[PDB]
C-alpha cells in the first residue's frame, strides 16, 4: 500500500478499579532505571503468571489480525484479555501513552499507537503487550501476516523470529550479554538487514525498563556477564533499508525514513540454574 499516516485514537479504555495500577500511571516518568538485576524467588513466580497473560493477550490479539480490523480492534482485544485476567496493561499510562499495546504495521520499527488504521492485504503487523499483575511485568510482541504477504515481507518476518529465537538459545549464567546482539546481528546481516540501535531490549521486574539495557547489535565493550534469576527482554527491530528513522507527531510512532519495512519479537526471559526460561509463554 501507500506509507501510513496516523489515524484517529478512541477514547481511553477503562481498567477495573481494583486491578493495581503501575505507580507511573499519571505521572510524567517511571520509578525505574536502579532495581536489582537478578530478582527473588518470590518475583519470578509473579513473573511466570504476568508474562503468561501477556503472551494471552498477544495471541488473541494476534488471531484477529486480517484484511479488514482496525489498530484499535487489536488494542480492544488485548486490553479485554488483560483486564479479564486481572491485569493492568503495562503501556496504558506509561509516560503518557494512550493505549493498551503497541501496534506497529509495515514501516514503523516500533512504538505505533492502535487506531482508526485499517490493516489491508499484505500488510504486516507487530502487536507489543505487557501486563503488570502481582507487581511485575511481562512483555511479548510478535509481527503478524495479514493476507497474502510478499516473500521479501515474509522472509524479514521469519528471519527476524529466527535471529530472536537464537539470541534466546545463547542464554545462560556466565554467557556474555553482548553475546545476544552479536547473533542477532551477525544473523541478520547474513541477509543484508539493519538491525536497530537506537530501541533495545530491558531487564524488566516491579519495574517495566529496570536500568539493565540488551543490544541487539554487535558491542563487545558491554561487560555484564549473564547470572541466575536475571530477567530481561531480547526484542530486536530488523529493517529492509536503512536505520534512519522519524517520529510523528503524536511523539511515539517511529518510522523508517525509507519506508522500507521492518519487523520484531519480543520475549521475557529468566537465566535459570542452567539456561534460559521463556516467561511469556502460555
Ligand atoms: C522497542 O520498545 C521497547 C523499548 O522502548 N525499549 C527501551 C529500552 C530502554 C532502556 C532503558 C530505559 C527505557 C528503555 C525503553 C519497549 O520495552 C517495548 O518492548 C514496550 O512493549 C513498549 C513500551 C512503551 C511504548 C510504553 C515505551
Ligand atoms: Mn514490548
Ligand atoms: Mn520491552
Same mark, same amino acid.
Given at each position: 500500500?501507500?506509507?501510513?499516516?496516523?489515524?484517529?485514537?478512541?477514547?481511553?479504555?477503562?481498567?477495573?478499579?481494583?486491578?493495581?495500577?503501575?505507580?507511573?500511571?499519571?505521572?510524567?516518568?517511571?520509578?525505574?532505571?536502579?532495581?536489582?538485576?537478578?530478582?527473588?524467588?518470590?518475583?519470578?513466580?509473579?513473573?511466570?503468571?504476568?508474562?503468561?497473560?501477556?503472551?494471552?493477550?498477544?495471541?488473541?490479539?494476534?488471531?484477529?489480525?486480517?484484511? =479488514?480490523?482496525?489498530? +484499535?480492534?487489536?488494542?480492544?482485544?488485548?486490553?479485554?484479555?488483560?483486564?479479564?485476567?486481572?491485569?493492568?496493561?503495562?503501556?496504558?499510562?506509561?509516560?503518557?501513552?494512550?493505549?493498551?499495546? /503497541?501496534?506497529? !504495521?509495515?514501516?514503523?520499527? /516500533? *512504538?505505533?499507537?492502535?487506531?482508526?488504521?485499517?490493516?489491508?492485504?499484505?500488510?504486516?503487523?507487530?502487536?507489543?503487550?505487557?501486563?503488570?499483575?502481582? =507487581?511485575?511485568?511481562?512483555?511479548?510482541?510478535?509481527? $503478524?501476516?495479514?493476507?497474502?504477504?510478499?516473500?521479501? *515481507?515474509? !522472509?524479514?518476518?521469519?528471519?527476524?523470529?529466527?535471529?530472536?529465537?537464537?539470541?534466546?538459545?545463547?542464554?545462560?549464567?556466565?554467557?556474555?550479554?553482548?553475546?545476544?546482539?552479536?547473533?542477532?546481528?551477525?544473523?541478520?546481516?547474513?541477509?543484508?538487514?539493519?538491525?536497530?540501535?537506537?530501541?533495545?531490549? *530491558?531487564?524488566?521486574?516491579?519495574? $517495566?525498563?529496570?536500568? !539493565?539495557?540488551?543490544? *541487539?547489535?554487535?558491542?563487545?565493550?558491554?561487560?555484564?556477564?549473564?547470572?541466575?534469576?536475571?530477567? $530481561?527482554?531480547?526484542?530486536?527491530?530488523?529493517?529492509? =533499508?536503512? !536505520?534512519?528513522?522519524?517520529?510523528?507527531?503524536?511523539?511515539?510512532?517511529?518510522?523508517?525514513? +525509507?519506508?522500507?519495512?521492518?519487523?520484531? $519479537?519480543?520475549?521475557?526471559?529468566?537465566?535459570?540454574?542452567?539456561?534460559?526460561?521463556?516467561?511469556? /509463554?502460555?
Amino acid at each position: 500500500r501507500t506509507a501510513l499516516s496516523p489515524g484517529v485514537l478512541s477514547p481511553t479504555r477503562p481498567v477495573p478499579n481494583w486491578i493495581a495500577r503501575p505507580e507511573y500511571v499519571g505521572k510524567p516518568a517511571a520509578q525505574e532505571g536502579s532495581e536489582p538485576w537478578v530478582q527473588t524467588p518470590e518475583v519470578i513466580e509473579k513473573m511466570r503468571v504476568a508474562g503468561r497473560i501477556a503472551a494471552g493477550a498477544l495471541a488473541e490479539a494476534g488471531k484477529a489480525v486480517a484484511p =479488514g480490523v482496525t489498530t +484499535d480492534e487489536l488494542d480492544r482485544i488485548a486490553h479485554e484479555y488483560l483486564v479479564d485476567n486481572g491485569a493492568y496493561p503495562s503501556t496504558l499510562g506509561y509516560k503518557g501513552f494512550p493505549k493498551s499495546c /503497541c501496534t506497529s !504495521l509495515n514501516e514503523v520499527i /516500533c *512504538h505505533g499507537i492502535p487506531d482508526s488504521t485499517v490493516i489491508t492485504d499484505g500488510d504486516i503487523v507487530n502487536i507489543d503487550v505487557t501486563a503488570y499483575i502481582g =507487581g511485575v511485568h511481562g512483555d511479548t510482541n510478535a509481527t $503478524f501476516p495479514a493476507g497474502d504477504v510478499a516473500d521479501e *515481507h515474509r !522472509l524479514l518476518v521469519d528471519r527476524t523470529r529466527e535471529a530472536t529465537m537464537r539470541a534466546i538459545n545463547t542464554v545462560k549464567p556466565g554467557r556474555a550479554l553482548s553475546v545476544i546482539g552479536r547473533v542477532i546481528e551477525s544473523y541478520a546481516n547474513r541477509f543484508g538487514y539493519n538491525v536497530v540501535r537506537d530501541f533495545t531490549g *530491558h531487564g524488566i521486574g516491579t519495574t $517495566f525498563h529496570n536500568g !539493565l539495557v540488551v543490544l *541487539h547489535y554487535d558491542q563487545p565493550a558491554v561487560e555484564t556477564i549473564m547470572q541466575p534469576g536475571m530477567t $530481561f527482554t531480547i526484542e530486536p527491530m530488523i529493517n529492509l =533499508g536503512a !536505520l534512519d528513522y522519524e517520529i510523528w507527531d503524536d511523539g511515539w510512532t517511529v518510522v523508517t525514513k +525509507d519506508r522500507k519495512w521492518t519487523a520484531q $519479537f519480543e520475549h521475557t526471559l529468566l537465566v535459570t540454574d542452567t539456561g534460559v526460561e521463556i516467561l511469556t /509463554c502460555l
